[PDB]
Design an enzyme around this catalytic site. Sequence first.
Site, PDB file in Angstrom:
ATOM      1  N   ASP A  12       8.313  59.175 -13.723  1.00 27.56           N
ATOM      2  CA  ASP A  12       8.147  60.431 -12.960  1.00 27.56           C
ATOM      3  C   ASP A  12       8.346  61.635 -13.857  1.00 27.56           C
ATOM      4  OD1 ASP A  12       8.067  58.621 -10.686  1.00 27.56           O
ATOM      5  OD2 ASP A  12      10.250  58.566 -10.929  1.00 27.56           O
ATOM      6  N   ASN A 192      11.575  63.450   3.540  1.00 26.47           N
ATOM      7  CA  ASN A 192      12.611  62.932   2.648  1.00 26.47           C
ATOM      8  C   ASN A 192      12.711  63.993   1.543  1.00 26.47           C
ATOM      9  OD1 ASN A 192      14.564  61.396   1.301  1.00 26.47           O
ATOM     10  ND2 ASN A 192      13.059  60.015   0.368  1.00 26.47           N
ATOM     11  N   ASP A 195      11.942  64.707  -5.080  1.00 28.38           N
ATOM     12  CA  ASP A 195      10.738  65.030  -5.886  1.00 28.38           C
ATOM     13  C   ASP A 195      10.431  66.513  -5.939  1.00 28.38           C
ATOM     14  OD1 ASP A 195      10.622  62.314  -6.179  1.00 28.38           O
ATOM     15  OD2 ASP A 195       8.501  62.093  -5.781  1.00 28.38           O
ATOM     16  N   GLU A 261       3.889  61.654  -2.592  1.00 25.02           N
ATOM     17  CA  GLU A 261       5.095  62.218  -3.237  1.00 25.02           C
ATOM     18  C   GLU A 261       4.759  62.705  -4.644  1.00 25.02           C
ATOM     19  OE1 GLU A 261       7.409  58.585  -3.332  1.00 25.02           O
ATOM     20  OE2 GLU A 261       6.639  58.146  -5.344  1.00 25.02           O
ATOM     21  N   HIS A 352       2.818  59.767 -10.215  1.00 24.99           N
ATOM     22  CA  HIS A 352       3.848  60.808 -10.372  1.00 24.99           C
ATOM     23  C   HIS A 352       3.543  61.736 -11.534  1.00 24.99           C
ATOM     24  CE1 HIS A 352       8.003  61.946  -8.839  1.00 24.99           C
ATOM     25  NE2 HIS A 352       7.752  62.836  -9.780  1.00 24.99           N
TER      26      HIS A 352
HETATM   27 CA   LIG Z   1       7.922  65.412 -10.052  1.00 29.24          CA
END
Ligand SMILES: [Ca+2]
Length: 803
Positions: A12, A192, A195, A261, A352
């Site tokens: 990520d 949620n 991120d 996400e 990501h």
């Molecule tokens: Ca990120």
Amino acid sequence: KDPQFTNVSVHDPSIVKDGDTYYIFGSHIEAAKSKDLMNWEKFTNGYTTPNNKLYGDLSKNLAGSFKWAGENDADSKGGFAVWAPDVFWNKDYVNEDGTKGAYMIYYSVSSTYIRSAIGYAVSKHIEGPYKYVDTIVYSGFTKEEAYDANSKINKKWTNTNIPKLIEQGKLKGVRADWFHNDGSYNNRDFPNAIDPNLFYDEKGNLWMAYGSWSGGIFVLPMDKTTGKPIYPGKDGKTPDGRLVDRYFGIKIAGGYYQSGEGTYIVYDKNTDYYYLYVTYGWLGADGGYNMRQFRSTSPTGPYVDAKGQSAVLPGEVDNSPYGNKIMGNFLFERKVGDPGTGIGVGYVSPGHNSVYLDRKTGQQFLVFHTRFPQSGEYHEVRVHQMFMNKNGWPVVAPYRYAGEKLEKVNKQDVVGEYQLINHGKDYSADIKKQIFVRLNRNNTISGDATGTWRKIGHNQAEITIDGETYDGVFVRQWDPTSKRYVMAFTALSNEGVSIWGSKLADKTDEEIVEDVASDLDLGDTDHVVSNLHLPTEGTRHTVISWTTSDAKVVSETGVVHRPEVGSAPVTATLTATITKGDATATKVFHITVLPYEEAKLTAHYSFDNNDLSDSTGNFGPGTITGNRIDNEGGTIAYADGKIGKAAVLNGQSGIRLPDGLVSSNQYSVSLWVKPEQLTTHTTTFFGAKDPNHWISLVPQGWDGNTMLWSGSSPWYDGRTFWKIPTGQWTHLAFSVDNGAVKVYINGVEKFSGTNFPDVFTGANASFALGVNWWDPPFKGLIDELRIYEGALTPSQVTDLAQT
Ligand SMILES: [Ca+2]
Ligand SMILES: OC[C@@H]1O[C@@H](OC[C@@H]2O[C@@H](OC[C@@H]3O[C@@H](OC[C@@H]4O[C@@H](OC[C@@H]5O[C@@H](O)[C@H](O)[C@H]5O)[C@H](O)[C@H]4O)[C@H](O)[C@H]3O)[C@H](O)[C@H]2O)[C@H](O)[C@H]1O
Ligand SMILES: [Ca+2]
């Protein structure tokens, strides 16, 4: 191989540039750096603490947020969950000695799919260490006193900062929509809270976008001075009906538990768009992680795709058709006689992303992690250049960056034969693969598809295929397979579907055909025991046609027939006849198929004399365990069996067999079970050098069916897809011949598979019956445990299922 790469695992990754150095900060407190976006060098120590690089004393430093999640709690139990950070130099930030300017790091702590929060820490120096400041968005909090499994954190909303936010009038009070009726968190419409992405807008105002699955992505304006959100204060909707929430902000993508996400948003001035990137699907090899793109003229949205569809989902729907699917699973598959070696370059579950936009040059880079084909969950970072197509959509290069850059390209250098991948919209474990086309000098496209193309200006590419016009660019790229810089193109339709092209090297049909021959091997055709895979295509739709000198030995498809025990071994000849155009070549292979040899009985614990003896003489008797393999304190009775007397396993006890009972990769096991009950994982035949190196014959495995199972380095699923009956006898057995594993039930082959672990040779292994290290002992009778050196013949096994 001019260019040269040096890889890392950072999951990520958020790209950021200090001086002339590139930096990527990932989950699990990993970070690396580069001068060239090519060779990376890791400088973290992961979750080590204290003296954690980024934090020092991770636990005291970040205690602010671990109070709520990410330390030794529920899913974080036994470690930490510090996820998906974002870094950026904030020049306007006031430090706690009152000076100005600081690198800020926003991070996620999470302890379940929904209980998370975002916090941030600051350093003056990019490499660290960073120091806690505040924890600022929470999710997963409840209406009333609540706790999660393996947690004693009151989830109630009063543990959050919200109390204090209301205390300050930053909010008028609690919203009833956040809770369902039982009072659980409303993660259908609310996010949620992980991120984080921090970005500046047209005027250099600052925003945080965040969210992952659940209610989706929100965005919040941020105070440039303290780094705190300027929370909305009121609910509402935006002009196009998207949700605004007093605390969470303005919903800008996703919804209704759907995936999405890893948000990253980028303002481009050269076009004035806000480009929003988000990654769909699950992150693991089987999850089909893929990157998506939209754009808005306003940072706050509405964000839409090439077809003008909203990033925000209308209900609980397949999100497949929303956003531009700019990258997902792909493989420029090497076929026989392609240059290079192995399967070809491709990714699995790439996603990501972050993005870097070099302010002076317009140059742009997509930075992300991906898994790979046949690598499992192993992940490295990758960097693909991006270039603004003519419709204001950056289009993503096919290969990772290798110094290349936009150029004046001549038409002759384009014309030719290409590999063509089309990303589509769909996403799953399935991998997208190439077709072959060519771009002809008269601006047509022929081959596996038909249509047209032009090169506008230096590099702009127009491609048009069964009505679809894809707009992008042409550009040279490093191809690791051929080990050359090759011409290439990437382009977006108005469906928001990307196609990618890599140019193949000119080659006469003669040339191709000899290349294919040279690459066509079948391995060992001298000691052949199972069917051979005869490939039927070579590179570039080269037809490989196969004949046999004797189909009794082996068919044109490579179906072999092993002669009987005690029969001579038989021979035959296979002829590859390779054809492209009118060019042709011919490679032969001489085959030898071996008869069966009878596997040879080495130990037989029949239990027929009310004892644990090995009627062969070859081994010492068994001895009695407790409920586990390495303990004691059980009873074995001897009831009437399938053949004479049987052992009795009472659920508390089990049988220990001599170490080295098996010691080869050429062996077999037979036995008869009549199970009184069925407990998942509970073994019958258990063999193990140690707890990460074991093999287990299981009546009800993880899939709830009988299965031969091996773990943990590596796992291997011998799946029968067949369910055992209780209170009834069932004969089981399995073969292992150097790599090859078959499994039979009641005489019948239910699994054949390949690459099975060699677990009984290079040390000395423990063996047992009904017990292991972990799961309930076996309940019931086990009979006629026969052990063999050799892989049992199919006929030998039908003798065994007979009495
Ligand atoms: Ca990120
Ligand atoms: O005595 C103390 C213990 O010793 C050490 O054991 C090491 C670990 O235990 C071994 O696994 C035992 C096995 O796992 C338990 O079930 C969990 C399963 O893990 C998942 O594996 C993935 C599956 O494999 C493939 O079939 C397929 O791809 C996946 O579905 C699986 O899904 C779960 O069911 C069960 O209790 C037991 O039988 C391993 O070798 C090692 O990791 C420990 O330190 C301590 O516990
Ligand atoms: Ca018996």
